[PDB]
Structure formats: C-alpha cells, structure tokens
Symmetry: C3
C-alpha cells in the first residue's frame, strides 16, 4: 500500500505562465482545467493530485524542480479524476510494485487538496 496528500494555495498556480503550465500538465489536463468554472482552482487541484499521487508511490524524488507531467490526471465520468503514469513515474511505480493508484480532489478559498492511495 501507499498514501499521498498534498495541499496547495490556489494562487500558487499562475494561469498566465504558459511555460510552467506546459512543463507540468499534459495537453489533456490543460484542456480540462481551462474549461472549468474556476480555471486557476482546477489547475491547483490537479497539481495537488499529481503531488499526492507521487507521495503514495513510495519512491525517490528527482528534485524539487522536476516536472510532474509524467503523472497524469485523467477523467472517468467526465469529471472524476483517475491516474495515468508515464515515463519515469511509470517505471518508478512498477519498480515499487504499484499496480494501481486512486486519487480525489477538492478545493475551497484557502487551498486545493488531493489524496491518493496506491495498491501493490
């Protein structure tokens, strides 16, 4: 097993910063977040989900500045978040015996938060 939690300030996401966004979010994630009622809040929630998922893997960090594009949040019933690992995240997870990851997201004025649980 494994568990992850992450909390983010809504203002931590600068929607105007295309470089930051493009480096850390897949085109699909960007399309989803850009279409929500509160775009900044949606990106913040997705960012929290990426971090929560990473923490649940039980692996080593590549460094404070490594992009999280490899951890992709996809949707199920249109809006519910599912996890898809790619690249290094996929390798590291498989190397750790992780067979599945579930995630949930929520936000309010204070911050966005996400919780992930992984199965081995």
């Amino acid at each position: 097993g494994g568990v992850g939690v992450d909390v983010e300030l809504i203002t931590s996401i600068n929607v105007e910063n295309d470089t930051f966004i493009e480096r850390n979010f897949t085109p699909q994630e960007i399309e989803y977040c850009s279409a929500q009622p509160s775009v900044q809040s949606s990106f913040a929630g997705t960012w929290s989900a990426k971090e929560a998922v990473f923490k649940s893997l039980g692996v080593k960090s590549l460094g404070g500045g490594a992009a999280l594009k490899d951890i992709e949040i996809v949707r199920v019933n249109k809006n519910a978040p599912a996890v898809e690992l790619h690249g290094n995240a996929k390798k590291a997870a498989e190397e750790a015996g992780v067979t599945d990851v579930k995630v949930s997201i929520s936000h309010d004025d204070l911050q966005a938060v996400a919780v992930a649980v992984s199965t081995k």
Copy 2:
C-alpha cells in the same frame, strides 16, 4: 477496484439556521449529534465534508436524484471513529458499483473542515 474521496469545506459554508437545507441533507441522528457538539457549525461542516468525501469515493457519476446527501449517513460512537451507513439511492448506487465498505475520517480547525473516505470493492 478501490476508491478514494476527499472534501474540504469552509466552516461558514453551513448555515445552522437554514432548517430546510439541514432537514434535507442530514438524518435526525446527524442533526442531533452536531447540535450537541461544542461548536455546532463546525460539526455540521465536518459532517457535510464527510458526506461529500464518501460520495467521491463511490466512483459513481451521481446518486440518481436529487443532489441531497441524506442517504449517506455518518454514524458516531462516543470516543470512537465515525462510521458510514448508506441508505436509499446511495446504497443502491454503491452496491451497483460493487462497493462493499466505506471508511471516513473528519477534522476541523478554526478555518475549515476536511474529510477523507476510502471505499472497498
């Protein structure tokens, strides 16, 4: 298989005066419990967060009308952990999704309430 849910709520998101909303979304036992706590508004907010967290963990697109959450009941046993009991549409939707169990946890501070639920299939 498996499922997870998290929800965060402002304490002020619950208006204890709004009897109509409370009646619609909380069971008599939930209302009785929350009404008896040191901070009533905070307790309702935590219970509300728990209902939302539990719903998100079920992996369903919605409960099947309406949006009311009375069907997801938080049961309390003094000095012990909160527990989940599903009724009505929530129970049907959960069973239809293969959910066999749901655990929940609640926390508050001055600023907000948060709950986390995990479901088993």
Copy 3:
C-alpha cells in the same frame, strides 16, 4: 481497514512550549523538526500525522489532552514518512488488529495536513 485525516494551523504549534513539545514528540522527532527550514511548520506537520494515524487505528480516545509521543513519525533512511507505534498506541493497535499504518504529510504556509490509512 481504517482512515484518518487531520488538519492543523501552523501557528497551533508553539515551539517555545518545551513542555508540550517534550510531552508529545520523541527526541528523534524533535531533532528532525528542529533541523528543517521551517521548524514550526515541521512540528505542525508531525503533529497532524500523529493525529491522522490515531484516527486510522479505530480505537477509543484517552481524552483531548492525552500525549501522542507513542505514535512516532520516522523519516530518514526513508523516502515517505513512516509510522512506528510504541507503548499504549502499539498495544491498542494490536488489540484492534492493525497490522500496518501508512501516513502522508503536506504543508502550505497557512496549514498542515496529514492522511493515514491502516490495515487489519
């Protein structure tokens, strides 16, 4: 199974309060938190982890004021923080059939949050 979550204001921890710190944190925890970039935030996160872990055990509370030194958060030769139960926490957990506990911690500048999941 069992789940626990706890959220704390960073300012809820008074680092000056040696009595509170000594009563609730092991020497190892105190050393770790005291060495972090933000000491107050680190203690707050560790406190939240203790609370989250307790909630996941599915046991009765000894009271609002009971010390939590028995629930130790270890990070070191560890990637993710890990849980080690001692004393009464260990007995109570074993008595409840808990065989393992995982925990995760997150901070922003305002608050800390932790989530724990226990296995039976």
